[PDB]
Amino acid sequence: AEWPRKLRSQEWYGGTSRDVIYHRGWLKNQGYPHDLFDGRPVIGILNTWSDMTPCNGHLRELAEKVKAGVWEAGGFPLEVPVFSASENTFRPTAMMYRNLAALAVEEAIRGQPMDGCVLLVGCDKTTPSLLMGAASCDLPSIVVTGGPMLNGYFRGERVGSGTHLWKFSEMVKAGEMTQAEFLEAEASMSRSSGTCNTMGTASTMASMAEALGMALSGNAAIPGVDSRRKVMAQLTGRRIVQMVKDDLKPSEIMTKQAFENAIRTNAAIGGSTNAVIHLLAIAGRVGIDLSLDDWDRCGRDVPTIVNLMPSGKYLMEEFFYAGGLPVVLKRLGEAGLLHKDALTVSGETVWDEVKDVVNWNEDVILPAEKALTSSGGIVVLRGNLAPKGAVLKPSAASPHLLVHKGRAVVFEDIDDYKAKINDDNLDIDENCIMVMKNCGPKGYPGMAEVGNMGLPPKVLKKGILDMVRISDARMSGTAYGTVVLHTSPEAAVGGPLAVVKNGDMIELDVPNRRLHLDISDEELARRLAEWQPNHDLPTSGYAFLHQQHVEGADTGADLDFLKGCRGNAVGKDSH
Amino acid sequence: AEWPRKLRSQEWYGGTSRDVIYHRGWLKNQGYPHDLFDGRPVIGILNTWSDMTPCNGHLRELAEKVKAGVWEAGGFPLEVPVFSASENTFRPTAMMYRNLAALAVEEAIRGQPMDGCVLLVGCDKTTPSLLMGAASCDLPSIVVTGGPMLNGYFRGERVGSGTHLWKFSEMVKAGEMTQAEFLEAEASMSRSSGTCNTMGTASTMASMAEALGMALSGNAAIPGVDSRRKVMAQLTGRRIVQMVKDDLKPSEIMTKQAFENAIRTNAAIGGSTNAVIHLLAIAGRVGIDLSLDDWDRCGRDVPTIVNLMPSGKYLMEEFFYAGGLPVVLKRLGEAGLLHKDALTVSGETVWDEVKDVVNWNEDVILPAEKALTSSGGIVVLRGNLAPKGAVLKPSAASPHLLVHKGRAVVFEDIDDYKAKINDDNLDIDENCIMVMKNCGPKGYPGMAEVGNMGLPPKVLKKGILDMVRISDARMSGTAYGTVVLHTSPEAAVGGPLAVVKNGDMIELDVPNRRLHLDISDEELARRLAEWQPNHDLPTSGYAFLHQQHVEGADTGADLDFLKGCRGNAVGKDSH
Amino acid sequence: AEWPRKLRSQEWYGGTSRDVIYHRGWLKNQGYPHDLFDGRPVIGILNTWSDMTPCNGHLRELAEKVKAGVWEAGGFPLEVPVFSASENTFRPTAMMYRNLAALAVEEAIRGQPMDGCVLLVGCDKTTPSLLMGAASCDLPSIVVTGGPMLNGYFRGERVGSGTHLWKFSEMVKAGEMTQAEFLEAEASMSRSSGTCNTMGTASTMASMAEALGMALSGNAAIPGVDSRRKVMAQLTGRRIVQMVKDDLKPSEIMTKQAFENAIRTNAAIGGSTNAVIHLLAIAGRVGIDLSLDDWDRCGRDVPTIVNLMPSGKYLMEEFFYAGGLPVVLKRLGEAGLLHKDALTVSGETVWDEVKDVVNWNEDVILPAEKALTSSGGIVVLRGNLAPKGAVLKPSAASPHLLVHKGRAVVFEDIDDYKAKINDDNLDIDENCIMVMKNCGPKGYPGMAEVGNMGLPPKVLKKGILDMVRISDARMSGTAYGTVVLHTSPEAAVGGPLAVVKNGDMIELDVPNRRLHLDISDEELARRLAEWQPNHDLPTSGYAFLHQQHVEGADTGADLDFLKGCRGNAVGKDSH
């Protein structure tokens, strides 16, 4: 684009009119030199920091680095706190407030005199929500990731965030660990500022952002307390000023190819299943046609090479020390699986960015022959039970369970599950299929991460830690097991999942991508005719708004009226 | 000057040696991009903020504004807290630690990789102490003033900092006010972040800094919490980087002409007597020949036109709104008393900065016809009692007392005074001369602001609030009355003041600049023969160091081994 | 002591006088509720944070944590910035400004209304300089250490702070590495906020603070960016308020026993040689009789069990995860070598604090059988060459060099050394003794860490990396080799070291604690007769003060007039 030119912030701050005297004069009460309103890029630094978002605890100091960079490049930096949907505080689930966060971000951007955006994110649902909001404005934007926590250590051994919550709690149910020992582990599990240090959702979404080209190279893996995280933040501050001048917009970066690069990256790293929903939602904002079939297709026969929990052994520190995501992206290029010419926020192509990096640890970023799985991409299951699709993360599942037929053990909701699961009178064995409903977008509500249901204690005492599980819910990115997720349509909207009964047989067949409830179309069709929504609905408030407008996980679980891009035209003046 | 060139910071951060890797590498742990060490000006921002220095409470936020300006200008800002000698916490007196602070500042500057300096100052002693330290290095330096507090208001009346402490305490002694009423006034006396809102030492030194050309024009009068204080700091941050390139040094700015400009400014503003000691000390660092005689000469027949307490009516707020110090400097120019070509830190002459300013209130910045005093300059008294000189601030004195002879009422020290003053049986009247000794640099020690001795209550009960007072001490800039100060040599070093006895007659004659003890040289000389250093002396610590090396107030009360400029040569490498 | 009682802060803030209205009133301009001045403990938080002290870069956030704790316990926290003598910025050497910092800290404490002190430290000289200053006031005080950096990783290998600076520079001289490769290591050498991650001076002095009982248990080893460092800081804030009420003073904690524990602790950890000088200096403030002989005696036959660089293999991270210093103190207790009843700041004895801790890594905190050295205590050498003493760190020395005789190759100063050392024509081999003079307190000046002289490059290419070296200088705790240090009296004051000549033979015998110059007794005396203070001496400034008043390393290199405790009596009133 042409520079110099009149930027949208000048609608507020350029001129001699009464409106400009009002806008410019009031901001000046914070002590800003007059020439800051001379047309230089005005940068909105969107911060998801909060004392109730400990994964983002260091983001104010990151903001200062960003500010410094904007000043250096001759911009005008303004820190703007935005809704922070922390995974670790919000109940019923942070997922329920992602669209709310996305909405407020969109309005904060379009409604206020900023010419460009810096997206300060970290905790799980902060990355997609700001990406959704910024994409729906399509102003020049760039991502700064907070970074993972340092490795957790318990009794001289590695402890992964979230992953060891499942492991220890299941060990306790098996009688192989006491709750007292579990409590002792708490202190040294989260011992620095940052996000979960496994390949969970936050680490995955950081990787997607970088793989999408919406963040500078090397952004994802640097630990929150690492010095180079701050270097990154300041360098990002410099870049956004130039991006605003060059008018480098999200639509030019997040293309279909870019999303394809992102999906294969998810396969290579063995990333969270939540990335599926989040990418679909974000794609729905950019205006790109992206579907579950694209995920299944692109991820097919792409091996996981990142050896981190829950799929592998190590943590984000080792991943970073090995060389981080650029090494992974370079490998994808070498396999001919990368759209090498994909443009990034640096103004350079993704390949030009990563082509010369070195793998410093092949025990962490494995050679292709030694992949944890040959086809690491999340798999999309189709069938009478999931007509709109369901997902599974193969790199953390059990090979002997990937093809499996068993009797359905059914839970009507999470309350139903929690009441039955620890009961020794529960008619269930290791060959049964655990099935749960009413845990989707509308059902839970908000679609909580309860898909990785803990096994029956009497099964766990046999040393059996994996069983086939199916639901219309999510599970933590740090979670594992042969779990089928995002079953669409959910039970709460009358999907076939609603009418699953104890005793019914279910066939799981991942290689053929099929999930089959073994009853006749006749029996199924008549079951659905008698269906009713036996869940509690809200009468007012945001819970109500959510219940009315939220879509299925198969499309990204967005709000129907929030889909698409609405541009960044400046609204009418207030007086 | 030449730019680009190799700056002194490159001695630390320039090159490829182990030591540079050491120096540069360690600083990088705070997350600094490599190019910050490329030779661009590295700015040391010396902050005198402290929680025990409430007058500088907002200097941390002001440091940030300076930082932003340095970033904008392409420099490398680094905040460095320095010794902060607060007037309101330090005992026996903040004055005793001025040289200590000055000592520490000099070493912090020369020993560390800064190419230029920003001096964040406010409370009384902070401004000169940082100026002394910086002058003895002569790197490009610039002053940022914290600023005065807002006006205090008590019971529908303006209350000035410090000035109403003397007034109320004397009113309580006069029985015209209760201590209870005094305590109630405290809450609304200091009600914003900043320094004393009268023409005290802080406001005076702020004006001296600007009058010397060591601060951007308009620096002195801006209130601490006013938005334009923040604008100023950021602009200062921009300017210091250019000053480093141009190598604009204090020695080039603080010339004899500048010090003369400062003196006439002090007269015009009716500034504190403490400016004498501070300017003499600062002159002693730059290497400028400045004496008490210079003070007397330059200030003579310079009228006070600034109508602020303790001399006048209003406060720093009105002074700022009237137009502040630039209006005052312009008036000096119109009277032909200004060295118009004196260079300032802005690169412009003092006249070029002030030549176009407007007086917005002549009730505050008075016209020459309406001046408070025609010869407002501090007067230097000579004579047998003050062989090396003594001073008095005429603009806060009583006209009928400037020429006066009276019986001496003698106090041997502050303890003696405190024991005798409130005794109704004390033989004293309004015509007596109150005399106190052993309150100088060595005597007190530290030369406290105890010179403005409260009058005997039986004299105050006559509605008489002024008496002739003589001592070797200082007094607050907020203080008033016909008080003779800085009597040199002090009694503790055997000055004639030491042997004054009750009954002796004392002649005060300001127009003839004379201070005479009316006894024969024979009687005086024989009295001195019996003099001894009648004090309990310290054997160690800084108090001892002070006792051994401190000079008289007639030369600025510096430490003998601290006088002069020692340059800014980098010492040997540490490794 | 009895509570409630009148604390020293009440001299400022307790009562109804004019002075109290002044003192209390001014601090109120920063927005403090009145009851904060009711006599509750006023805590001075002494912060050595500075942008030019990157090792203490995160101390403001710890200061905030300390503040929160003080509030909780019902105190009145006030942050007070103090002089920060960073090893990595100050030249000629930070050591020259350790005493300057101690003076300023002392005066800031005694001169201001604080009832207790929190010492925020990190970088080498910050800990002892503040401990000296606080000890000379003897108010209730407690230490918070910033904490070490994370491990440096370059090309999949551990890099220790400082230690690998010496190693690589010698490797480059040996031709085993290029300088270009050295620069690539810079980025990943210091990659988090904190001090050297080896057992350097900072880690040593941090351990001394904890071993003395002047910090909460576990304070020394916690990484700067670890969450529990912040927990530590807040708990310290709570504790200091209680310490002030109980009046728990440094003199009660830093007893002869406490210093003995610290010395024995230093041996176990294989700590820096600088701990000798610093402990001697600090003991001289408390008024405890401590000498070099105490060091020699207490350290003899105490084995180093800490497996960290430069003595061992690992870094402070591994040390912390293993259990840190409490485990080390426990082992001394188990060996019967600990003064178990020594009181600590927690109000409990050191044994009560550590007796139940667990060793989580026996490869890092070694069992006695696998100690690096059997007698790990620093050894004191005596003889004609060092009549007042010299020291050596055995755990990082070469066993085969501990008893050794060789031709002395003499360098007259650091300039002499650097001019000759890299010359291939220099007559020297692996059996010669490298000797350098004029690097002591007065000589250098400031006694730099240059004692570990790099070997001749032609010697290094033979694979010989250690030589016996002698000087009057210091060396980094991160340094290693058979190096003789702190030779007293120094050459600059006419010590026998001054008259050493090329060709002289020197006998080193650590078991017999002897250092012998092989010349006749007569020849030495006549050599000294020709000695002159052949240095460029300062004529003014602090450099002059240093030259006039600094003592030898044999007593801690303090300033002679600063020794001892001068108490904390509140000074005379300021008005």
Ligand code: FES
């Ligand atoms: S909760 Fe923030 S990343 Fe797991």
Ligand code: FES
């Ligand atoms: S008290 Fe700080 S300026 Fe008067």
Ligand code: FES
């Ligand atoms: S330099 Fe600050 S700790 Fe080593």
Ligand SMILES: [Mg+2]
């Ligand atoms: Mg989650």
Ligand SMILES: [Mg+2]
């Ligand atoms: Mg004063």
Ligand SMILES: [Mg+2]
């Ligand atoms: Mg050291």
